[PDB]
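Weekly sync notes, structure subgroup
Attendees: PM, AL, DS (notes)

Item 1: joint prediction request from the bench team. They want all seven components modeled as one assembly rather than separately. Inputs as received:
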Amino acid sequence: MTDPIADMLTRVRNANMVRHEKLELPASNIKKEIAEILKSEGFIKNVEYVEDDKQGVLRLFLKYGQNDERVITGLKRISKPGLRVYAKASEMPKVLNGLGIALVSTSEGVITDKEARKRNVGGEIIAYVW
Amino acid sequence: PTINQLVRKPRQSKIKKSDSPALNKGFNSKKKKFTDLNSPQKRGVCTRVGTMTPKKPNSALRKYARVRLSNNIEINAYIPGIGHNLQEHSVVLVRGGRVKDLPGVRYHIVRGALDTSGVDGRRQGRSLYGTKKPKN
Amino acid sequence: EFEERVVTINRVAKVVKGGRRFRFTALVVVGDKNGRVGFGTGKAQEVPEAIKKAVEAAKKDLVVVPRVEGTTPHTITGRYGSGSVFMKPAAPGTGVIAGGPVRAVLELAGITDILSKSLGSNTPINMVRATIDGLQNLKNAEDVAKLRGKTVEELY
Amino acid sequence: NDRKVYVGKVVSDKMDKTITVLVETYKTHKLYGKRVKYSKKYKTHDENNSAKLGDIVKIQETRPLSATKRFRLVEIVEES
RNA sequence: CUGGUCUGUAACUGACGCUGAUGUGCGAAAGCGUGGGGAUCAAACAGGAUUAGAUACCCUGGUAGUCCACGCCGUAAACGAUGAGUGCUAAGUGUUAGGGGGUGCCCCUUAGUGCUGCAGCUAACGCAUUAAGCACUCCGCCUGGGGAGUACGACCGCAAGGUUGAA
RNA sequence: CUGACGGAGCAACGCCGCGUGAGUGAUGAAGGUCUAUCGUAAAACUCUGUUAUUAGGGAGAACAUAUGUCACAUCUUGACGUACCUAAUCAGAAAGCCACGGCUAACUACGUGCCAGCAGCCGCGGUAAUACGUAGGUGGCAAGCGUUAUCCGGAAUUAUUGGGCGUAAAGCGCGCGUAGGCGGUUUUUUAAGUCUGAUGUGAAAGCCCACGGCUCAACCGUGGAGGGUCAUUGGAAACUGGAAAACUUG
RNA sequence: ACUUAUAGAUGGAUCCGCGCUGCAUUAGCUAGUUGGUAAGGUAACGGCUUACCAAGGCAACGAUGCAUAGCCGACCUGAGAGG
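Output from the run, pasted for the record:
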C-alpha cells in the first residue's frame, strides 16, 4: 500500500478490458487529482473527490464511449516510488504525436499535458492515458 | 530487468573468441614471447608437404601443405585449387584464415608471392592459383 | 486492379501408404494502393494461379488504414505474437523503407511517407501480422474525443 | 570567489583533537541511473571540541594549517 | 508436553516500515555419532539354467544395514524445474476444524484450499473474484552452441567432498 | 647558425587535376563461347592539345645606425627564380576486370567421365560443370584486377535510450536474515533543489549553420550558435530534501 | 651607457576542485590508521624527516594491495546519447 494509486492506475484498462466497471478503489490527495482532471474531457462516470478521511473510498465509474471500444486502450505509469524519472516541461515527449493526454502535478500548482507545453511548469510527468 | 542491483551488480556481453588465434603472430627469440599483431602480410617456410586421404564430402583426391611457422610448433595449411606445386622450402606471402572444409589449418598462399608464380595451366582464371599478365 | 505479386512459395508433403503427395503453398497480395490487403487460402498444388486462387477469396478480410494525409497520425510498435514493425508520420516525400510483402502494405497504402522498419521479425508469415496490428490501433482526426468525451482540439 | 559551507556529521576521534566531519551529497552515476546516496570522509580539527558523540557541523576549504588535515569551520546544528 | 496459526472484530499504542549478500545458518534413505547389530531378509551373490547365446529382473538361503535416546550435515527429477510487495475485469464451486447474518433451513470471504472455467492478455500454452496478463520490488541471472570444469585454482571443511576457473 | 625551419629520388601510398586516339562508320570479311552472338568488329579517312622538337621564361614582395632627425626609410629582396608554360601539335593508347548461373550482383559451353576437380554464408564435376582447365565478355570499372582485417549505425547478438523467467541458453532448502535499493494516509514544519534564471552576458579558429581567397581538389579565413548554473543567489512547498505529528479497521 | 628603491610579465604553478582505468582466485585494520602538538624550510600552509601523547582510527562499502599507465584540437563514425 506504499503507492496509494499504483495498480489502481491501469486498473482503468485492467478493469475495462471488456469495458467493465465493478471495481471500487482507494484514495489520495492525487486520487483527488488522478480522476478529476480528465472529466475535463468527459472520461469518467463519476469521481468528484474522495468523501472520507484516512484516504478512503471512491467509485471508479469509468466512462465508456460511443464506439464501444476501450476508452483506455492501454496504459502504463512510468512514474512510481522506485522509478523516479524527472524531466523538464519543454521536451515533454510527443504522447503518440499528441493523441494521448497527461494529467500530473507541477512545480507551480497542478497542470496537464495541455500546460507543460505552454507554461514551462512540471516535475515527474507521469503517463500516457488512451 | 530491474536497475537497483544493476549498479550493485552488472551484466556481461555475449561470449565469442576471434578467428585464427595461433595466427597474426610473430614468435620472439630475443624476448621469447609472441607478438599480438594482426599483420597484413607474412612469410611461410616449409617443413614438409603432407596429405591425408579420407575425404567424404568431395570424394575426389587432393593433398595439402604442412608448413611450420616460427620456432618449434605445429602449423598446418592446405592448397585450395587445381594447381599442384610439387615444391617446398619456400618464402611466400601468407593468406590468413581457412577456406571451407579443412579443420585446424588457417594459413595459405597468395598468387605469385615471391616463391614461385603458380600452376601455369591456368590462363582464363587471370586471378586464381597463379595468373599474371593475362589478356583481359 | 490488385498488383498480384507472389508472396511466398512453400512446399510440404503428406506421408502416406504410398508415394507422398507434394503441393505448393501460396496466396496473393491484393493491393488498392489505399491501405488494405487480404488473402485467399488457395490450398493447392499449383504455383501461378494460387495468385488467382487468393484473388478469388481475398475480400473476406481486409481492414482499413485510417489514413491521414499521406501519413498516420500516431506512432506504433505493436505485434500480435512476435513480428513487430515501427511506424510514424513523416514528410510526404521521405524515401521509402520497408521489408518483405509489407512493401505491399506500406507502399500500397494511403501513406507512402514514413520512417517504417520491421522491429525484429521480417518473414513471409510475420511482416503482414506486424503491419496488420500496426494499422489496427489507429484513428482519424475527429474521434478520440468521443470515447474520450470532448472535441479533439482539446489536447493541445 | 569565496569558500563553501561544507557540512556533515562525526564518527570517532583520538587523543587531543584528531577531529573530523562527515561529507556527503546528492548525485548519481552516468550508466544505470539510480538515486543511490554516497559519501566520503574529511579532515577538520579543533582544540579538542568538534569531535565524536554528536558534532553535526560545517567545514571549510581554506589554508588547512594542518598536518594533512584541511578544514577550519564548525557551523553546527546541535549537540546531544 | 508445546507454540504460533488465527477463522470474528479488533480493547491498548497512534506507523506500530517492504526483497532481505552482513551474521546464524540449517535441510532425503543411505553418507554420516553410542554400542546394541539379526525379525534376518537384501548387496556379493554359493547355486541351478538359457532359444544360437548369462555370476543375471527369476530362484530357498547369505557377512554392512534391516532392532538406535549422543559429532555435523547436503548432494536428489527441493520435478516444487512454480522466487517473494498492489489490487484485479462471472462467480458459483468441492468444501475446511473453525465462522461474519445466522439455526439437520438459506451462507459470504475478514478467510483457507483445489478448481470447470467467463473476461482479457503471454508466445505456442496456461492462469481466472479465490490470476505468469496491467502498475511501483529486491538477490539477479539470462543474451547462439559445444568443449569447459579438463592447465589450473581460492577458501570452508569428521565424510561423501565441495566451491572456485583462462584457454 | 640553421643540422630549428628549409630545398626533395617521389611510394601510381591518399585520392584527385585531367591526358593517350577521332567525324567515325554501310551491319562491316577474311568470323572468336553459341553454332546470330560482344560485330555498327573492322578497315582508311579525320579531328583535340593535353603528353613531345623548342622557345624568351624573372610567380611575388619589401629587407636595413650614418641617408634626417620607439610611425618609421634609400644609391639595399632571382639556386628551386624557370611556373600560367596553349604550341605548331604528328596520332605521343586507358595496364586489364573478377567469379564467369542464382544470392555477393556472372554467359554459354567443348575439355571431364569421378581421373584431376568447382566453392564469401547457400553452394558444385559420376558421360551435356547455364561454376571447373581454357576460350570472344554482360553487372562494376580504366590508374585500376583477387586478396589483406579494424571498429563503426548495420549486430534489435548491451538493453543510457533498444534486457527472460514455467517453458531456448534462465528463479531460491528456506524458519533464518546485517547493510541498504526500495521504504502507508493527510497536513506538514523545509523555503535547498527541480519550475528552471535574472545574471556572468570573459575569447574561441569553428559551433544546430552557412560562406569568402583559391586553374575546384593539397594547403587559409567573418564568427551573429557566449564558450555551455564558469564571475549571483533564486521566487512555485505540489516533494528525494534541518522534519513536528495525527488516522487506524492494515 | 652603467647599477636600484619599483614594475607590467615567463614557464609555471605554492596548491584547490572534478578531471584522475581494470584485477574479488585480494578486508578482521595500518602501527602512524585517526589528527592536534616541532628547533626546522622551499617565492609556498603543513607528519613533508623529525613534535607530544591515546588508538580501535578501521570496521564486511573496497582499507589496501594491485595490471597496462599520458592526456587532448585528430580520424572511421550515430539520428542521438556520444561511442
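Discussion: The longest strand of chain A covers residues 24-26.
Action: AL to compare against the crosslinking data before next sync.
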